[PDB]
Amino acid sequence: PVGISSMVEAMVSRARIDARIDFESGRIKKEEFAEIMKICSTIEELRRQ
């Protein structure tokens, strides 16, 4: 692979985009999406410390 971002910075964005796409066009419960993104923001606050 090729990329200057950290592993976590790429993984979080990929998870968020995948959640968006399989929520809108695909089929997933909004609560599962919300928990995905709350854990993602938890990591966002965690990778800063």
Binding site: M7, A10, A15, R20, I43, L46
Partner: protein, 717 residues
């Protein structure tokens, strides 16, 4: 949510949080190769111990509703904790979900290709022989359309993982593969491996004993052995053994045309830029094709590329094995009482010359040939090899054997260098030097025979210092890459003072291609197509200083097709018609302008007469073009707006990064952007496998075209 949950419960432990934070994506491959590295305990024995155990195979959980627990004989094949007995495989193999997945032979074509080669692969007799190794350089991949590894793995990423394609956002196989195997994916990683094995070339050095094509090498275990040989023709052939030949022919013709050009370098480069070879561009092919030929090396040198130490002479490429050299200019007298200054190669030297159909190993002293081992296919081929060898030998013996005036000329009527003059003289009649060289006794050892002046092999007698090898001389193609120093006349030097190559030795085979060299129909259509292509600049260049537009030397190939007698009358007629159109504004039709323009290139003569038809001689026969309406030579449809020149058609009349991830223009997107193409929209998208970058539309191309040549308008003012 499983993946992100693993991320969360992994980022709490500190010594892993730090390493997930610091190390970047570019380096995952350098961190993927950090293993315990111990599970190498006799894989056959551990495999046998596990197979002897009950249910060693591990599968997924969907077999519970797919295969039964007990078979037709009460055999156990399941577990719980998910282990599986191997007999379960054989059950599902017998009567299960039969599917039409027989679509298979499109992704695995690289193997059925070999199967079909074996089907009609007619065999032959086994003439056993002491097979001797020929160190050749061959390719090991069949039928791959000659694609390099980088652009091929880019096509891989494009066809198998579009949502994470590479960042180069500036190709027909991509369409074919994405179309035919769209919804019938098998195993993405294995598909990628199969296509990288099918499409990527690889040429390296192998010892062969007669195999040239790719099909002749992939079956080398049948053809070649220690002391045997089998004539086997695999009833077929591939593209990658007759594609590089097209580039070779293109380079030969381009150099042969540029040698006549006033500026050979610029003309040759402008041709190489404006040339297409099987749906592709010449510059990228030359940048990525590892084909070795004089003209190809000249084209590579024209763009400053490293190539071999090729001491090319008479079409034979030389490679130095050992020995140094010193220039030491010297005067010499010929066999016809003629002074010649020459660069006497002093010192001890060792060379290996590889030719088209013959090769040799030479050990040579100052103007004295010590040893020479030659092998070719035809009698005359080894004769030519020995002729060029004796010419390079520079001995006084061959100097004495010169008979007649030495005036051999280039196609541009130029003095050839003395060495090439000697070679070109000897190539037609060389029977003077043979009987004047010298004969010696040999011992007829180890399949090394001698040759006689009358084209006769001999056992114990040979020419002075000569050896003919049986079953081929070992070739060595040493890899060396150094920068070149091209001049304006297509003679390349190695920057230290050696003239490497020159066009004086290029042409031997006018291959029939499996800018006026094609038929005159192509001259006509190409003139009209070039007019239509850059039509917008011609429209104002026809109004402003049209004397320079006419004398554009791009019309010279067509200006020479109109008969040389009535050229000026046509020119004056069309120019006065153009001036009449310039005076009376608004009363002009572009159709007649394109119909009659390229004739204005001629020096006009004020003919007190007019015309209604103009003639062109193609293949002898004359074809006309009218002055009003359509003609078979100029047929322009009124509604279609397409121009028909002898039936043949002739013209008609990614994104960019704005910065890093920016939370303004919505959330991040995947790489599928056709619904935000409304009139133009900015959006941040994750490109490749890295971070997110903004993206907008495009307004320019930024190609390798004349935009690179605009520098000459602000540099060298």
């Amino acid at each position: 949510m499983e993946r992100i949950k693993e991320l969360r419960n992994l980022m709490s432990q500190s010594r892993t949080r730090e390493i997930l934070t610091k190390t970047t994506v570019d380096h995952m491959a350098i961190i993927k190769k950090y293993t315990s590295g111990r599970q190498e305990k006799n894989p056959s024995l551990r495999m046998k111990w596990m197979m002897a155990m009950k249910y060693p195979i591990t599968a997924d959980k969907r077999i519970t509703e797919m295969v039964p627990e007990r078979n037709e004989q009460g055999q156990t094949l399941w577990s719980k904790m998910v282990m599986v007995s191997p007999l379960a495989v054989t059950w599902w193999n017998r009567n299960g979900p039969m599917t039409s997945t027989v679509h298979y032979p499109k992704v695995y074509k690289t193997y059925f290709e070999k199967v079909e080669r074996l089907k009609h692969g007619t065999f032959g007799p086994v003439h056993f022989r002491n097979q001797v190794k020929i160190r050749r350089r061959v390719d090991i991949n069949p039928g791959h359309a000659d694609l390099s590894a980088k652009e091929a793995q880019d096509v891989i990423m494009e066809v198998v993982f579009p949502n994470e394609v590479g960042a180069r956002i500036l190709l027909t196989i991509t369409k074919e593969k994405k179309e035919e195997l769209q919804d019938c994916k098998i195993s993405p990683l294995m598909v990628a491996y199969m296509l990288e094995r099918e499409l990527v070339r690889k040429t390296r050095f192998l010892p062969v004993a007669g195999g040239t094509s790719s099909v002749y090498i992939e079956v080398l275990h049948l053809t070649q052995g220690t002391c045997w040989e089998q004539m086997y023709t695999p009833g077929g052939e591939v593209r990658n053994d007759d594609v590089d030949q097209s580039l070779i022919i293109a380079a030969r013709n381009i150099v042969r045309r540029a040698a006549v050009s006033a500026d050979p370098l610029a003309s040759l480069l402008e041709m190489c830029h404006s040339t297409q070879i099987g749906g592709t561009r010449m510059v990228d092919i030359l940048r990525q094709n590892p084909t070795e030929e004089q003209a190809v090396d000249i084209c590579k040198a024209a763009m400053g590329l490293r190539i071999s130490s090729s001491f090319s002479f008479g079409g034979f490429t030389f490679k130095r094995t050992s020995g140094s050299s010193i220039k030491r200019e010297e005067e010499l007298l010929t066999g016809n009482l003629q002074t010649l200054k020459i660069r006497v190669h002093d010192g001890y030297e060792e060379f290996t010359m590889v030719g088209k159909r013959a090769t040799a190993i030479l050990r040579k002293a100052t103007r004295r040939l010590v040893q020479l081992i030659v092998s070719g296919r035809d009698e005359q081929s080894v004769a030519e090899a020995i002729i060029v060898a004796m010419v390079f030998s520079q001995e006084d013996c061959m100097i004495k054997a010169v008979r007649g005036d030495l005036n051999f000329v280039n196609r541009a009527n130029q003095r050839l260098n003395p060495m090439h003059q000697l070679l070109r003289h000897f190539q037609k009649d060389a029977k003077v030097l043979f009987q004047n060289w010298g004969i010696e006794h040999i011992d007829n050892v180890m399949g090394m025979i001698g040759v006689l002046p009358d084209m006769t092999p001999s056992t114990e007698m040979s020419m002075r210092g000569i050896r003919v090898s049986k079953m081929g001389v070992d070739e060595y193609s040493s890899t060396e890459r150094v920068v070149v120093s091209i001049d304006r006349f297509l003679r390349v030097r190695d920057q230290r003072g050696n003239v490497l190559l020159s066009p004086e030795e290029v042409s031997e085979t006018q291959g029939t291609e499996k800018w006026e060299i094609n038929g005159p129909e192509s001259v006509l259509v190409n003139t009209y197509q070039w007019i239509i292509r850059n039509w917008e600049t011609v429209k104002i260049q026809w109004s402003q200083n049209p004397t320079m537009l006419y004398n554009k030397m791009e019309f010279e190939p067509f200006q020479s097709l109109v008969p040389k007698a009535i050229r000026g009358q046509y020119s004056g007629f069309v120019r006065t018609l153009f001036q009449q159109m310039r005076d009376v504004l608004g009363t002009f039709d572009t159709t007649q302008i394109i119909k009659l323009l390229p004739f204005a290139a001629a020096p006009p003569k004020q003919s007190r007469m007019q015309f209604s038809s103009l003639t062109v001689n193609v293949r002898g026969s004359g074809m006309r073009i009218l002055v009003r309406g359509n003609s078979p030579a100029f047929n322009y449809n009124k509604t279609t707006k397409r121009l028909t020149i002898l039936g043949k058609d002739a013209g008609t009349l990614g994104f960019l990064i704005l910065g890093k991830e920016d939370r303004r223009y919505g959330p991040a997107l995947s790489i599928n952007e056709l619904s935000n193409l409304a009139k133009g929209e900015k959006a941040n998208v994750l490109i490749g496998q890295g971070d997110v970058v903004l993206v907008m539309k495009r307004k320019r191309d930024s190609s390798i075209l004349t935009d690179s040549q605009t520098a000459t308008k602000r540099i060298r003012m």
